[PDB]
Design a protein around this ligand. Structure first.
Ligand SMILES: *P(=O)(O)OC[C@@H](CO)CCn1cnc2c(=O)nc(N)[nH]c21
Ligand SMILES: [Mg+2]
Ligand SMILES: [Mg+2]
Ligand SMILES: [Mg+2]
Ligand SMILES: [Mg+2]
Ligand SMILES: [Zn+2]
Ligand SMILES: [Zn+2]
Lengths: 69, 174, 925, 155
RNA sequence: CCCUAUAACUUAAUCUCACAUAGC
RNA sequence: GCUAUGUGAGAUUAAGUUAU
């Protein structure tokens, strides 16, 4: 249950790296901070909490279309 | 192996087997030996070239389709995760309700959501609090695409075509 | 009461008897002792004296003490006579001699007045033998002399130099007091010389106000010809001088802490007469000759002795004076700026010999050393002030600042869902995922560079370092070394980087093909006579880890690498080739090498336990004296092929290239304070020399800090006596005692060394009596010599040798039955093996049909997990086997369905049967 | 006797064929080693030209008259390298991590560092976008992409 | 466009050496 | 003296893995 969260975190951060988030340094710093915390988290109650923030970074961009999915 | 005429010649020279065609089967054995060695060399370098073109083809396919395969893989395991907090913000982004900034984990922090139609408003908001990302949030205001501040009594059933449809809700966490 | 007023004397003071009655009191103090029977710097019980507390007229107890000495009758006449020849000096304390009736007999008393509670020996012992939870003397001194009040101590890890860098300020509050003591000692030595008095000065005869007493062993001689021995005093005090920063007042006007700083000329770099004046003021009675520039030293022992004084005196001088010394050079009638010298913090001023004011043209070698020079890059770049770091920033080369990030790892989904279909990654499992690629933001490279604030200038105990370097040399005497020509050089990789600025034009193959063998030999002969400063480039490393800290790797340029290969390769190859030694670099763990290494490290120890320690911030905080020591140990193999000035210029090139070089970090040049550069060719070997040095000085400090009366064994007591003699009394190398102490260490402290990681098998009975080093001795030694706090959560011990070492090179050890005998096999963390499989640094590694060769190596590395009692650990190896077979079947299917002729796929069924992996750990190669 | 005649002839062709193989291989290794050597000396000429033009532009980048003054004021014409950009650099770049460092280090259009007057020319952020001096404020500090890089000129 | 050093092991492909076999 | 077939050893190159 925890491992699926960590692997989805690394997949989400590599998607955000593909979408050129690091051209803005502040958003990329927030994304890396969220990604590192999920990996080192010792409980899955607060690892889903950071996952909402990291997924919302992607959802706030319109480079992807999730209407297709 | 059986696909040689030199194998048939060497097998004929061996089934004829005293010492005078022994010389014949010896030179025909050297013939069949160098022939089978050359066939092994051809099979060797053919396997080499086939696996090399396989490596480069699959590698260039990976490098070509990395971004679409990564975007497809992400919503495969997000769907597998089975989280209503994650499913709330995915279905809302499906029907058009996308945030403008990061959802804050902390309480009493600003949140900028966009609601584009009235059913999305009424299926999210009821009263002065509205539910998003499996949490209760405090409406501070809601502003327009034409940049004027609207209070909650102004938007309703009948005058929702009257106002401009991008409604940007500023929200603080409970 | 009649004894209390007798002690007050003519001077008026209020007293309170610390001891009861007219009897004496026992105190537990530290003494620097040396007798015919006992020696060492240990804590003994003091029974001779009786001390009286003084209190102010507002009635609280103050630091002044009245300590009376009840001794024999003939000591009274002798002490009184010596005191009357030194009474005029302001360095001596006040002595009031009298006789007072105790039990009907008149007993002579020597009352020493206005003393502190603790001596200088108590401070030096409390800082050189630091143990948290047993540090009450240091806390009492720090509370007493206003360095910090008592609730500063309440804060957790107040002593840690890494978790609390304010402890340097707290310790530097004692610097002014220590400096005053040194001045008083010089005054007392001048008074002893003028009064014709000879004698040894020790730390326990001087209190923390700097006043002197205890003229017990002093003997009179012709006035004007008195020699006082201060070797032990100064050398025991030497780490405290930089830990408390005693000479910080010397950078002010008139040496006063209220005055502003001295404003030196910015063009000035020499500071030779200033170093001589500092030595003449503070260490006037030090018999050994001091050379401010180490180009004039006589051997490597003199180089170490003079560099130890240079690291103290260089803290006074401004930091813009150190580094490359540049001059105007005219090539083609056009002026250049090239570096024709170097001013070292440790080696003084070094001047290049082969300079030419005017050059008609530039040879490929001249272009190569002018391009590698930081002078042209820094003299044309912009001025840089970087407030992100505390380290000294030189120049910005680019108009922009580069911010490089670390990408996240690529996820191998097929191996992960194959693993979770096989039953892995359940809840409550002993196998977790803990090794991931951690991403880094743009501020990561310069925040990694700000860990060089953990490097501090460190003066060493020079006598024990000189003895320790001789013992360390014995460990490396089996190997053979020396210089080799350019055609004998073996380069592992020629398509790696060439460093800055050589990475702009190509790889290392370009510079090994563009340069002839004559050119490389001419460049090596040029470095034997000149100093070429180079630029090291810092690059973030994209590798899997269990910690979210970024890791940088230093990239040394091709000039320094090319010359250091010819200097060091014969010795480095020799160390790797040797088997069964202490340093185990080059020994494979496969084919029974782990079992042979473990059998070798156990050797023949009578009461064997196992022990392994840690170096916190090892490359960052390694002091420059130990790095120069390691370079001199590795350079001692050049006795036949090199002269002394050739070896000095090779040492200076090593210092200017990998110790204090200009570091390019994002298009910006910085000054590196010191430490070890990973990119350097000899980094692994030098870390082994450093590890052996720290273990040997831990044994030396363990054997001298024990009570020599409590040592029952006569051999160990005589060894302790000769150890103190060869450290502090003898000035020349006693090779017989160095061989005897090395034999004692090989018998009782057996070590296995690989870079900065080491495991030691030792006699636990000798450790429980203090005769060999332990964890506490290592923590104390790393405290006063490495400026780090080694916690006990990172060290381990092992009392049962049927289990191996707890961890070595991040491998555990199990005793398993192979064939008819029991062997030791290494096994890794299963999270590490699983992590490599589930995450990769390339999208090409995410399919398995191209990367069956990758999972075979992971399976080979994870084979000994099958002998584990944990079923989950055992299951990890099988999972890799079944995945390799699945990759084989998918490769067969895809290569058949795309190309209609079937691949025969020969000799591939060996990869999923465990005999191919069982053969990697059986001894027959 | 013609069987021994083609025996002698076949021994002669075996000799000349072995010499044929070794001399063709010899021309092969000679031509590929002269390929290696010719392309390697072309590499050497290219690296010589590249390092030479790098040093030749780098000499022209440094302002000499401010440099020859501090070199001629030296007692031997030898100075430390750490003072050359400290005293002769026209531009200064300051990397500032937050606002508390900014208001101390460079507040205003002109600040003082290293015994010189520096006139601020341009400020960029970590995204290298031009930041106005009016934008750098205590209340606008969470909107800036820190660090800021301030390039100045010597006044 | 940047990506260090050293050590060990695995796989692949070449080139020499030794041995066994058969012809001139 | 030569030619061809296999079996092992060493060297060179390429790719990968682990450790520090
Ligand atoms: P280890 O990782 O615990 O070693 C400590 C270390 C300092 O970083 C020194 C060892 N070292 C030196 N150079 C190195 C390098 O290029 N790579 C690695 N992994 N370790 C190095
Ligand atoms: Mg004494
Ligand atoms: Mg005494
Ligand atoms: Mg370490
Ligand atoms: Mg380690
Ligand atoms: Zn010397
Ligand atoms: Zn030499």
């Amino acid at each position: 249950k925890m491992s699926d969260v960590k692997c989805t975190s690394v997949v989400l951060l590599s998607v955000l790296q593909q979408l050129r988030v690091e051209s803005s340094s502040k958003l990329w710093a927030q994304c890396v901070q969220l990604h590192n915390d999920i990996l080192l988290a010792k409980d899955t109650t607060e690892a889903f909490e950071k996952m909402v923030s990291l997924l919302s970074v992607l959802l706030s961009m319109q480079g992807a279309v999730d209407i297709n999915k | 192996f059986s696909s040689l005429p030199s194998y048939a010649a060497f097998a004929t020279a061996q089934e004829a087997y005293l010492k005078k065609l022994k010389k014949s089967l010896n030179v025909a054995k050297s013939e069949f030996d160098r022939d089978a060695a050359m066939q092994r060399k051809l099979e060797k370098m053919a396997d080499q070239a086939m696996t090399q073109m396989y490596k480069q083809a699959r590698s260039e396919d990976k490098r070509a389709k990395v971004t679409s395969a990564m975007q497809t893989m992400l919503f495969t395991m997000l769907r597998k995760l089975d989280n209503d907090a994650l499913n709330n913000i995915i279905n809302n982004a499906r029907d058009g309700c996308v945030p403008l900034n990061i959802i804050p984990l902390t309480t009493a922090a600003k949140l900028m959501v966009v609601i584009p139609d009235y059913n999305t408003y009424k299926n999210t908001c009821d009263g002065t609090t509205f539910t998003y990302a499996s949490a209760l949030w405090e409406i501070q205001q809601v502003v327009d695409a034409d940049s004027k501040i609207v209070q909650l009594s102004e938007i309703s059933m009948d005058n929702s075509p009257n106002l401009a449809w991008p409604l940007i809700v500023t929200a603080l966490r409970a | 009461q009649s004894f209390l007023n007798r002690v007050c004397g003519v001077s008026a003071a209020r007293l309170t008897p610390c001891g009861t009655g007219t009897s004496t009191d026992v105190v537990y103090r530290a003494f620097d002792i040396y007798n015919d029977k006992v020696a060492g710097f240990a804590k003994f019980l003091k029974t001779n004296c009786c001390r009286f507390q003084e209190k102010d007229e507002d009635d609280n107890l103050i630091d002044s003490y009245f300590v009376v000495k009840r001794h024999t009758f003939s000591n009274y006449q002798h002490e009184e006579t010596i005191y009357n020849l030194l009474k005029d000096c302001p360095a001596v304390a006040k002595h009031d001699f009298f006789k007072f009736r105790i039990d009907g007999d008149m007993v002579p008393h020597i009352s020493r007045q206005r003393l502190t509670k603790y001596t200088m020996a108590d401070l030096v012992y409390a800082l050189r033998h630091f143990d948290e939870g047993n540090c009450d003397t240091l806390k009492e001194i720090l509370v007493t002399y206003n360095c910090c009040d008592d609730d500063y101590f309440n804060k957790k890890d107040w002593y840690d130099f890494v978790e609390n860098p304010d402890i340097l300020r707290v310790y530097a509050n004692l610097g002014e007091r220590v400096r005053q003591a040194l001045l008083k000692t010089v005054q007392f030595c001048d008074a002893m010389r003028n009064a014709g008095i000879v004698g040894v000065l020790t730390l326990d005869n001087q209190d923390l106000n700097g006043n002197w007493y205890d003229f017990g062993d002093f003997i009179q001689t012709t006035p004007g010809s008195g020699v006082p021995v201060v070797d032990s005093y100064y050398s025991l005090l030497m780490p405290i001088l930089t830990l408390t920063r005693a000479l910080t007042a010397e950078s002010h006007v008139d040496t006063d802490l209220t005055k502003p700083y001295i404003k030196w000329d910015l063009l000035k770099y020499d500071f030779t007469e200033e170093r001589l004046k500092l030595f003449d003021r503070y260490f006037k009675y030090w018999d050994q000759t001091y050379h401010p520039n180490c180009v004039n030293c006589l051997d490597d022992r003199c180089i170490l002795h003079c560099a130890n004084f240079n690291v103290l005196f260089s803290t006074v001088f401004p930091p813009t004076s150190f580094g490359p010394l540049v001059r105007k050079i005219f090539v083609d009638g056009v002026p250049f700026v090239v570096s024709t010298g170097y001013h070292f913090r440790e080696l003084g001023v070094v001047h290049n010999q082969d300079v030419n004011l005017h050059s008609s043209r530039l040879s490929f070698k001249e272009l190569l050393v002018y391009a590698a020079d930081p002078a042209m890059h820094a003299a044309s770049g912009n001025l840089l002030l970087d407030k992100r770091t505390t380290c000294f920033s030189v120049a910005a080369l680019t108009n922009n600042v580069a911010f490089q990030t670390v990408k996240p790892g690529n996820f191998n989904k097929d191996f992960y869902d194959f693993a979770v279909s096989k039953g892995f990654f359940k809840e409550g499992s002993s196998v977790e995922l803990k090794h991931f690629f951690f991403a880094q933001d743009g501020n990561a490279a310069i925040s990694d560079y700000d860990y060089y604030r953990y490097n501090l200038p460190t003066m060493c105990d020079i006598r024990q370092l000189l003895f320790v370097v001789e013992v360390v040399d014995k460990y490396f005497d089996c190997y053979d070394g020396g210089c080799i020509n350019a055609n004998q050089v073996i380069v592992n990789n020629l398509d790696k980087s060439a460093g800055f600025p050589f990475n702009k034009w190509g790889k290392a193959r370009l510079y090994y093909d563009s340069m002839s063998y004559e050119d490389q030999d001419a460049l090596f002969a040029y470095t034997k006579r000149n100093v070429i400063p180079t630029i090291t480039q810092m690059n973030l490393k994209y590798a899997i880890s269990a910690k979210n800290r970024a890791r940088t790797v230093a990239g040394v340029s091709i000039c320094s690498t090319m010359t250091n290969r010819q200097f060091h390769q014969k010795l480095l190859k020799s160390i790797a080739a040797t088997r069964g030694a202490t340093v185990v670099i080059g020994t494979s763990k496969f084919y029974g090498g782990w079992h042979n290494m473990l059998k070798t490290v156990y050797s023949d120890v009578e009461n064997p336990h196992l022990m392994g320690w840690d170096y916190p911030k090892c490359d960052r905080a390694m002091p420059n004296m130990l790095r120069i020591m390691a370079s001199l140990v590795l350079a001692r193999k050049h006795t036949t092929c090199c002269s002394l000035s050739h070896r000095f210029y090779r040492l200076a090139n090593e210092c200017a290239q990998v110790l204090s070089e200009m570091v390019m970090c994002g298009g910006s040049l910085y000054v590196k304070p010191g430490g070890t550069s990973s990119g350097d060719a000899t980094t692994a070997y030098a870390n082994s020399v450093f590890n052996i040095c720290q273990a040997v000085t831990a044994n030396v400090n363990a054997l001298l800090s024990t009570d020599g009366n409590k040592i029952a064994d006569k051999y160990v007591r005589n060894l302790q006596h000769r150890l103190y003699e060869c450290l502090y009394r003898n000035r020349d190398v006693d090779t017989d005692f160095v061989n005897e102490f090395y034999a004692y260490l090989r018998k009782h402290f057996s070590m296995m060394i690989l870079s900065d990681d080491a495991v030691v098998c030792f006699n636990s009975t000798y450790a429980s009596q203090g005769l060999v080093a332990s964890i506490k001795n290592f923590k104390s030694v790393l405290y006063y010599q490495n400026n780090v706090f080694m916690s006990e959560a990172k060290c381990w011990t092992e009392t049962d040798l049927t289990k191996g070492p707890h961890e070595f090179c991040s491998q555990h050890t199990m005793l398993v039955k192979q064939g008819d005998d029991y062997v030791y096999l290494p096994y890794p963390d299963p999270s590490r093996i699983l992590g490599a499989g589930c995450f990769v640094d390339d999208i090409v590694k995410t399919d398995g049909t191209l990367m069956i060769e990758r999972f075979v190596s992971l399976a080979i590395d994870a084979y000994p997990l099958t002998k584990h009692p944990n079923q989950e650990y055992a299951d990890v190896f099988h999972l890799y086997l079944q995945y390799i077979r699945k990759l084989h079947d998918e490769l067969t299917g895809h290569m058949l369905d795309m190309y209609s002729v079937m691949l025969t796929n020969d000799n591939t069924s060996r990869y999923w049967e465990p005999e191919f992996y069982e053969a990697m750990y059986t001894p027959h190669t």
